[PDB]
Design a protein around this ligand. Structure first.
Ligand SMILES: [Br-]
Ligand SMILES: [Br-]
Ligand SMILES: [Br-]
Ligand SMILES: [Br-]
Ligand SMILES: [Br-]
Ligand SMILES: [Br-]
Ligand SMILES: [Br-]
Ligand SMILES: [Br-]
Ligand SMILES: [Br-]
Ligand SMILES: [K+]
Ligand SMILES: [K+]
Ligand SMILES: [K+]
Ligand SMILES: [K+]
Ligand SMILES: [K+]
Ligand SMILES: [K+]
Ligand SMILES: [Mg+2]
Ligand SMILES: [Mg+2]
Ligand SMILES: [Mg+2]
Ligand SMILES: [Mg+2]
Ligand SMILES: [Mg+2]
Ligand SMILES: [Mg+2]
Lengths: 250, 252, 250, 250, 252, 252
């Protein structure tokens, strides 16, 4: 089963990691912690398909659901990741209902979508009964990260073939004319974020958000977000090294 | 146009270095840009092979730390290839005897001081036409002390002119002495052995380094007068940071 | 010369291999068998450009024509493969005449198409007279794998700049509401396949098909298909291992 | 600072290298010569993202500005390169004002463009004040390499968010019905090239051109081109080897 | 939390293993999910280097077979790096003497039983906090017997405590004895030599493995009481399958 | 179905070879298609590791030159893996003694002439069923002479039957003799030493090769009767060509 969908079905949110650093060793190590999922960022990172493919395997072995935040909402790219064992997709710049339908089209076989059939890794995980359960094995979230997406939230949330939305708050702040600060307190940004969550839940959809700290993630879980990521590997590692150096150098 | 670690030493100061077990260039550059004098890439207790180390050396140099490698083995050809790829410090495992220390030294210097083969693809680009005349000074070489035998042979190891000194691996020394392989071990016999190595190194006019798993332990080693202190592995730092973020996120 | 086009010019079909496993060693080994071509699948596989590039070289050295089935009908992706020495292209989801024209546009230099000039590997194979012969050095096939493509077959076959069509029968079955079974006996799927072949031949075009077995491939060659692939490396290897294990374990 | 923009601000053109061969060693070595920039060609080469990423680092270390000529004018591909430390972009097949606006959209954060925020490598080079200076850190040039682009030059040059244009003269010759000869003397091609330069300068924009020889590059610098590339690594290396062999074999 | 091969042995049963010469993770996982107890990655007669083996180990483990490696050489540092990357079985070539068998054993065990260096990046993730206390049991080590000399020295090789036993390479043994290097050779002198090795192994209370090129030969070796049987190389299986598909496709 | 270098020699002619320090297949194929008999991939003074050499061998073969490798070290297992990946010529560094020359020879020949392990993944594809009967002739092996010791031992090195001859590294020989490591050195003592090696090689009925940094120096070495001449490294040729293009572009 998809571990995130299991969380949801059991009435709990999912907490996920966020990787911008390529490689399998930290991917497995973080998957073995109390993360339900680990997202590999293929957008704001140097991680290409060749490097993502073994990382999916490593996260699955470590016992978290492997997710990818893609560089673009492109059906063929998403299909190839699904067939490589990405079991969650977070697609950037879903700004309109039509773009959300384009995301949905990639996530489902005919007749619900147009996903091409050749499920190399999912058929190894799920066996020959995969086709009947395929749609449920994948979680799909549309990114909300622009003014336009915010304006079109209800129309995006009307698309049956997506699970919900994923807020990209640094990009949303920037597009609203504010600083792209992680875990921002900017009142209009905080209000927009709450509005997206409320609309998603009203529409019977799931809502996620990207976080830069455990404390902000605790607040988002308390507010009812269904999928909360915290925090990027590179940021956590940089901050840890700075502290080690300060401690060493007195 | 100088080895940053050697510049620290020429000012009578220690060098503090990072320690990478995760392949890739992005964290390598980001950590090199911090207040580390060097960043060591571990090619022993990691999945980092030559193909992955090569671009990491470039990234560390661009970030402004001296690129170092802890090799999988004290093998002259492996070390030479790393030098020609722009490793400017070498930490070689399991140097247990004077002869093994001479083997390390042989790789680090052109004839007549050593037997290093000539083809310095990346050092020639960094140092330019002045390279060959200063080549030995551009590289730091440290012999690992991680066994009972190495401890018994410390003075003979330190007598080898062509190495700068020694690098203590405390976890492996504890395990070889019959203790648990603890990170930042303070096992009494291990502690005594380490103090002996540092005393002998400085008596010989050589440098002594040590691996640390924490900023706190590194601070103590710096206070004890170690010349080269590493802290802490990228993977360990990242794992611990993620565990803490998760605990904070899931807190009541 | 392109070995597939030589087959056609000499009045014989081409039989091709089908690789979903990255790497050069099996690619060369299979190219040295009595295959006229070897197709590298960049869609239902983990094979990215970095891994396809040496495989093209290895197939050419082994003495088969290197082909690629791309992840998408994208002109720039196809051009880069041509310049890396892919000498056949099979493009997915060609559903309309306009999509088939998009495929043709990538396969020909101006004035016939819009292919960008910088033929790194073809200029090494063919020399400075490459430009005059370039179009003939490449075989281009549009995939027919949807209901819509079937409905638009005559309009797709009207596009001068493609050699013909390549049936993807598992996807076609699925899109027709049937199980995506390899080498299917499903009557409507079998009928649709024969209809595509007959239309292609009537239009003076070539037709290919993907097969999962030697026996099915024998039948397709007998029915007159011009390009028959059999069978995917991973499927053949899995089946061989299962048999070895059954034999060993008694 | 971007070394090319420094040249321009100081009233001098930039001379750049041109790499079609993957790898970091020649990239650094050439960057250390008296090149202001080095362009990595991701179009007419086997260089994919995985191979370009370390090459950007190596060129920057060698002391030239790292540029990329992309396979396609795609915003998400361009963004990922920017975040990997490409500080110049040359985008193919900019044939219309709308296509030039698509290029501009990728090069600037909101409100000027729609660039997604997560500047992994530029934030290491430029620090936390990167956002305010981001646009100036990147040079963007639209390729002019078709009849249509030539016809639409004034409309392309009207787009505020691009620095100017980059002529691809082999493709331009081919699209005008001539041989795709490097450094051509063909009168209509030479005239078209001069016309693009004059229009660019009249519009207060920059103009670049691709060259195959030092002698042709000297003439283009004398004619006033702002960005001149000379010559591709593979071509220079092949010619050098041919000469070594002729000398050795007498 | 157990080595699948060792569990077979603790039940008095042989293990059957796959054999990979093709790099990549997809077939590695797919074959591991079959009724193989282990999958051996051949790093000797293949183009598989460390960078390619590392993700394959992960894929085999996920598929549910024990990941094994046949190394290019009996070199302790190479073997240690593979162990720390999650190779849980090692087959080392050209073990011709007791001293070479001791060299293999030295790599597989921490002090005091061996000299394995401490940094178990992947085994610590698989086994958790219980790892170090069981580390030796988590790994299987087999010395290859592939020469006349190894055959003469079989009893001394089998006397080395820290190896589980031996792995016969019949094609190389045939070639070294002066015969054609046939796959699944049945050359009479070779057959006799192999039976001698297996008898001596079991007399010593050790395990004996053998490489096979076919299911049929593997079935015989299992019947003869071999403890570890490999069958058959991915490349050979794939090539033969493709030849048969082509013959079927081109048949009248 | 023949080694192009050996065919040159069987016609009483020298072979001219390229020399690659840059990884990648595109220039490798392009240079192989020129009038080079062989292309040597340098795995010593380069960043080319096994994973990168493997596809380069394929590319050189397709381009129509014989693929050769100058290894990082004279190690039999490394050499065997390269042979099985389709390296058809081996140039091994630091062959200083007859015993080291025997070590090189051991890797290049199956039993009984050598100890090469059997698994010829790529040579079996190139040569087909006729491979094993001709295997030794398909490979050329040259021992590098680059030290004072090697020069003193030249006759004993040349007495080893299983090597085709020697390959002189003039820059490293100059450095080991106490001179500057100049490319195409003409240092008088170095020049004398090189002439001695070539005379001894031909006296022994063996082949003698030499590394060159220029077409002009290669022409002289061909005139002096060397059997295998390399010229010139890809990186050096490319750098010099780019410097000249820049000087032409920036000229008044
Ligand atoms: Br945790
Ligand atoms: Br809408
Ligand atoms: Br810091
Ligand atoms: Br066949
Ligand atoms: Br239509
Ligand atoms: Br210059
Ligand atoms: Br327009
Ligand atoms: Br099975
Ligand atoms: Br030539
Ligand atoms: K978990
Ligand atoms: K620093
Ligand atoms: K063939
Ligand atoms: K420069
Ligand atoms: K299994
Ligand atoms: K040639
Ligand atoms: Mg399809
Ligand atoms: Mg040398
Ligand atoms: Mg173009
Ligand atoms: Mg964004
Ligand atoms: Mg150790
Ligand atoms: Mg063997």
């Amino acid at each position: 089963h998809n571990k995130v969908r299991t969380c949801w079905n059991e009435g709990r949110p999912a907490l996920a990691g966020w990787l911008q650093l390529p490689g399998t060793l930290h991917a497995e190590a973080l998957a073995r912690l109390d993360y339900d999922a680990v997202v590999i960022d293929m957008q704001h990172s140097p991680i290409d398909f060749g490097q993502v493919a073994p990382m999916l395997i490593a996260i699955e072995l470590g016992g978290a659901e492997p997710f990818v935040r893609t560089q673009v909402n492109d059906p063929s790219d998403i299909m190839k990741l699904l067939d490589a064992g990405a079991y969650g997709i977070i697609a950037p710049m879903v700004n309109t209902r039509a773009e959300a339908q384009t995301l949905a089209s990639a996530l489902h076989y005919s007749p619900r979508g147009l996903r091409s059939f050749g499920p190399r890794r999912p058929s190894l995980r799920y066996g020959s009964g995969y086709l009947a359960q395929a749609s449920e094995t994948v979680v799909g979230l549309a990114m909300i990260e622009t003014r336009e997406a915010l304006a079109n939230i209800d129309e995006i949330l009307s698309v049956d073939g997506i699970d919900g939305v994923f807020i990209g708050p640094t990009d949303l702040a920037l597009d609203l004319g504010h600083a792209p600060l992680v875990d921002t307190e900017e009142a209009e940004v905080v209000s927009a974020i709450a509005h997206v969550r409320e609309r998603a839940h009203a529409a019977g959809k799931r809502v996620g958000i990207w976080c830069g700290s455990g404390g902000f993630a605790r607040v988002k879980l308390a507010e009812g977000f269904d999928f909360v990521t915290a925090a990027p590997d590179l940021a956590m590692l940089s901050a840890a090294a700075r502290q080690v150096i300060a401690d060493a150098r007195a």
